[PDB]
Amino acid sequence: RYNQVKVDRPDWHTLLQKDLKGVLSGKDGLYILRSNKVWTGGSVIITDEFAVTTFIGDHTGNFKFSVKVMTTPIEMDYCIKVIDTAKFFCVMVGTPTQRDLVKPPEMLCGCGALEVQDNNSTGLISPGNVLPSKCINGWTGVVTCHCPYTDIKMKFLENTTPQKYSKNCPGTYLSDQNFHHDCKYGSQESCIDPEPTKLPPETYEDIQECFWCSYYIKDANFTPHKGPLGWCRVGENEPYYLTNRKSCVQGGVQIGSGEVTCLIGTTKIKVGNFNETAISFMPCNPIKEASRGPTTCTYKYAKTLKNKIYDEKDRYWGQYMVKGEYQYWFD
Amino acid sequence: RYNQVKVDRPDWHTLLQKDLKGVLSGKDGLYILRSNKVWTGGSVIITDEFAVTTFIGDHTGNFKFSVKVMTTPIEMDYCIKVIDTAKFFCVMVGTPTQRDLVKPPEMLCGCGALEVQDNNSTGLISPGNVLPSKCINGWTGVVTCHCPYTDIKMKFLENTTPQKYSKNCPGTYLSDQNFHHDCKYGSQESCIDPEPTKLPPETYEDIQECFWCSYYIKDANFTPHKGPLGWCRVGENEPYYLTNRKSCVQGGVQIGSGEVTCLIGTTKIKVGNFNETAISFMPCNPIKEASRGPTTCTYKYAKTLKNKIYDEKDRYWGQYMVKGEYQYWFD
Ligand SMILES: *[C@@H]1O[C@H](CO)[C@@H](O[C@@H]2O[C@H](CO)[C@@H](O[C@@H]3O[C@H](CO[C@H]4O[C@H](CO)[C@@H](O)[C@H](O)[C@@H]4O)[C@@H](O)[C@H](O)[C@@H]3O)[C@H](O)[C@H]2NC(C)=O)[C@H](O)[C@H]1NC(C)=O
Ligand SMILES: *[C@@H]1O[C@H](CO)[C@@H](O[C@@H]2O[C@H](CO)[C@@H](O[C@@H]3O[C@H](CO[C@H]4O[C@H](CO)[C@@H](O)[C@H](O)[C@@H]4O)[C@@H](O)[C@H](O)[C@@H]3O)[C@H](O)[C@H]2NC(C)=O)[C@H](O)[C@H]1NC(C)=O
Ligand SMILES: *[C@@H]1O[C@H](CO)[C@@H](O[C@@H]2O[C@H](CO)[C@@H](O)[C@H](O)[C@H]2NC(C)=O)[C@H](O)[C@H]1NC(C)=O
Ligand SMILES: *[C@@H]1O[C@H](CO)[C@@H](O[C@@H]2O[C@H](CO)[C@@H](O)[C@H](O)[C@H]2NC(C)=O)[C@H](O)[C@H]1NC(C)=O
Numbered sequence: 001r002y003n004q005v006k007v008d009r010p011d012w013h014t015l016l017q018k019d020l021k022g023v024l025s026g027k028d029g030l031y032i033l034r035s036n037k038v039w040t041g042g043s044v045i046i047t048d049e050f051a052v053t054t055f056i057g058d059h060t061g062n063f064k065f066s067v068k069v070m071t072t073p074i075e076m077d078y079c080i081k082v083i084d085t086a087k088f089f090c091v092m093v094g095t096p097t098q099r100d101l102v103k104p105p106e107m108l109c110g111c112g113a114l115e116v117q118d119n120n121s122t123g124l125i126s127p128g129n130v131l132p133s134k135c136i137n138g139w140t141g142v143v144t145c146h147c148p149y150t151d152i153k154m155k156f157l158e159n160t161t162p163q164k165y166s167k168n169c170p171g172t173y174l175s176d177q178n179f180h181h182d183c184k185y186g187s188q189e190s191c192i193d194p195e196p197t198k199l200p201p202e203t204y205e206d207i208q209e210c211f212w213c214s215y216y217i218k219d220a221n222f223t224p225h226k227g228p229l230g231w232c233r234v235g236e237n238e239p240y241y242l243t244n245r246k247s248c249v250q251g252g253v254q255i256g257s258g259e260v261t262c263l264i265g266t267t268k269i270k271v272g273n274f275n276e277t278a279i280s281f282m283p284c285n286p287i288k289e290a291s292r293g294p295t296t297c298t299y300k301y302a303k304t305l306k307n308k309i310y311d312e313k314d315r316y317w318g319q320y321m322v323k324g325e326y327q328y329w330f331d
Numbered sequence: 332r333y334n335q336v337k338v339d340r341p342d343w344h345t346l347l348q349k350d351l352k353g354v355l356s357g358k359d360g361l362y363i364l365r366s367n368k369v370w371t372g373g374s375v376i377i378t379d380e381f382a383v384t385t386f387i388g389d390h391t392g393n394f395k396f397s398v399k400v401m402t403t404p405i406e407m408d409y410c411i412k413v414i415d416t417a418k419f420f421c422v423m424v425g426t427p428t429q430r431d432l433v434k435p436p437e438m439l440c441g442c443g444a445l446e447v448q449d450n451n452s453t454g455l456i457s458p459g460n461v462l463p464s465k466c467i468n469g470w471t472g473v474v475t476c477h478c479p480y481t482d483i484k485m486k487f488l489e490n491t492t493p494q495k496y497s498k499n500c501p502g503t504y505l506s507d508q509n510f511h512h513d514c515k516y517g518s519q520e521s522c523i524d525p526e527p528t529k530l531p532p533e534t535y536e537d538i539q540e541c542f543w544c545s546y547y548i549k550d551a552n553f554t555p556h557k558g559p560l561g562w563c564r565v566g567e568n569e570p571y572y573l574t575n576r577k578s579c580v581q582g583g584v585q586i587g588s589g590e591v592t593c594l595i596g597t598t599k600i601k602v603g604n605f606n607e608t609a610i611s612f613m614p615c616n617p618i619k620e621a622s623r624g625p626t627t628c629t630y631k632y633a634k635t636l637k638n639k640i641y642d643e644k645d646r647y648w649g650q651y652m653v654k655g656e657y658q659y660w661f662d
Pocket of ligand 3: 120
């Protein structure tokens with residue numbers, strides 16, 4: 001139990017008049033620490049690099065405590081010895097040199113700062129006082145504590161084999177839109193080198209909904225474009241996967257936040273002039289407008305951007321019928 | 332007078348019973364010719380290489396004649412001598428060695444054929460028996476007669492200096508359309524190397540009527556083409572001069588004998604499809620057609636050839652409005 005000396009608990013009275021210092025009894029033995037006691041009323045606070053213990057003794061000579069932990073110890077319990085008498089009790093339990101753990105427990109090191117030895121140059125464990133409970137999918141090496149004033153080196157976590165996967169800790173990352181990414185040395189809590197997960201080939205017919213250019217495609221119909229594109233969700237209530245990388249600027253036209261409402265399949269979209277003098281084809285299908293009032297000339301028309309022409313040529317004239325900011329198609 | 336022996340005329344009776352032969356008395360003297368007489372009734376025909384004389388003597392011993400000329404003689408008269416008596420009369424006068432003459436008189440050479448010596452390789456005087464009265468603008472050299480049986484060489488025409496121009500004989504040629512051409516060694520009768528006469532520069536505004544592609548331009552308006560073109564007449568009742576050489580095939584379109592009537596300025600023309608799949612612009616202005624019956628859509632239209640488009644773009648659509656074999660322009 002990482003203890004060596006028999007534990008004797010003084011009374012509340014002996015605790016007060018006597019001097020107390022924090023100690024570290026292991027297999028090697030007791031290590032003295034520079035402790036300063038504080039007692040005015042019914043409160044006794046011993047402050048140490050390792051921890052801060054508050055002694056509240058209002059009982060019939062009995063004493064109780066609580067501990068604020070500055071640094072977790074390894075393979076040695078943090079006890080309190082009475083100076084000049086054998087009364088030695090043990091307050092803090094301590095923890096082993098935990099090794100080979102994915103999602104390690106948060107181990108504090110206050111006395112000084114941690115030194116990391118990342119094999120494979122993982123650059124995963126951030127430096128400083130604390131070792132967070134960051135999920136560690138793949139990592140190898142040793143993390144050690146240190147303190148300049150007293151050279152105490154404590155091994156918190158050594159990984160020999162890389163345990164890549166944990167049940168509650170994938171090697172994947174999910175964005176806020178459930179966008180599936182793959183982490184080379186990271187998890188959901190902290191992910192190194194995320195690379196989107198590509199959708200499996202030949203399962204495009206299976207996919208239901210896609211997302212692209214700030215617009216959520218409904219039912220994956222995009223008649224003016226090659227199926228599929230963007231981030232696509234297979235089934236429902238599942239994450240999205242990367243399919244086809246297409247720019248949101250087909251020439252000098254931008255999808256979203258635009259002057260001109262049109263259609264990419266069923267989904268209603270807005271389109272705006274990126275380049276004023278860019279001559280390219282509209283990236284969406286047009287909206288029809290019935291102008292047959294009071295047969296006569298019946299045409300259908302759609303609003304269009306400057307120098308931008310929808311793909312449909314007028315049948316009657318075999319030519320792109322445009323005048324002003326409108327395109328027409330006669331019956 | 333190219334004669335040497337005193338002229339004595341026999342009676343009609345002496346002429347008949349006696350033998351007669353043709354002679355050539357010059358400065359050198361008399362040359363005998365192989366003559367054969369013919370006498371049945373009142374007709375005496377002496378046949379010679381030089382000439383054929385018919386003697387008709389029904390008078391009181393008087394005799395008269397006429398002469399068919401086979402070969403003109405030079406510097407010696409052709410007389411008839413009576414064989415065995417001194418009676419020698421002279422029938423044909425003869426002609427000198429004419430030289431330096433533009434439009435020389437027609438000189439016959441029957442006995443043989445002419446040999447030409449064209450200096451400057453004119454190739455103007457055609458070979459053979461006759462020397463026509465071809466107008467000779469520029470020529471130098473000698474033309475001589477010859478006869479194989481009897482070697483008589485007679486100089487008909489020697490040119491020393493080239494007399495290029497005669498009052499009734501220009502060095503120009505006029506076509507049936509009064510198309511002015513210029514002859515290097517020819518006249519209107521016979522023209523060598525004709526080269527059209529170009530119209531003087533800067534007198535294009537002055538010219539009235541032009542001719543091009545089987546169509547006579549009236550008043551030299553050709554609005555779809557650069558003024559002027561073809562053969563143009565300055566003033567009136569004057570010849571035409573060569574201005575601008577333009578093909579009658581602007582792409583795959585032919586002026587004249589065509590399906591489609593149109594206009595090159597004021598003149599009405601016909602146009603036909605040279606190349607079925609040639610894509611070029613019409614070479615004429617279109618004809619308008621009022622289709623405003625029972626406001627409404629009013630358009631004007633002109634018939635056009637396959638893949639041929641008139642220059643006028645429709646104003647309303649800024650595009651070449653074509654459907655079938657018709658082009659339209661809306662008001
Ligand atoms: C949309 O894209 C356009 C094309 O990229 C942007 O403007 C054009 O940009 C190109 C190159 O980026 C320029 O090309 C240069 O042209 C000059 C000659 O320019 C001048 O002369 C021409 C002919 O008269 C005239 O059209 C121009 O307006 C200039 O007056 C060359 O010397 C260079 O080497 C190079 O080839 C274009 O000139 C430029 N202008 C035009 C009208 O295309 C445009 O700015 C973009 N729009 C936005 C909002 O960014
Ligand atoms: C009017 O002019 C036209 C163009 O001069 C005449 O027909 C065309 O003539 C050109 C050359 O004289 C040919 O060019 C050759 O093309 C072949 C390839 O030909 C084949 O493949 C193409 C593409 O599919 C297809 O369009 C053709 O019809 C052929 O099936 C090359 O291998 C040669 O090296 C050369 O480049 C054209 O192919 C030919 N045809 C067409 C449709 O343009 C036409 O005949 C003229 N009209 C009259 C009445 O004379
Ligand atoms: C990190 O890199 C090493 C290679 O540099 C990977 O494999 C190790 O290779 C060395 C040299 O042969 C062996 O001694 C180690 O035992 C190997 N590690 C094993 C087998 O786990 C190693 O797999 C890499 N780690 C990660 C997480 O990618
Ligand atoms: C024909 O060609 C000659 C040149 O080969 C032209 O000029 C003659 O030149 C020779 C050589 O100097 C002179 O001896 C002649 O007297 C020149 N002829 C003249 C002066 O008439 C000649 O002009 C040409 N003729 C034509 C009709 O073009």
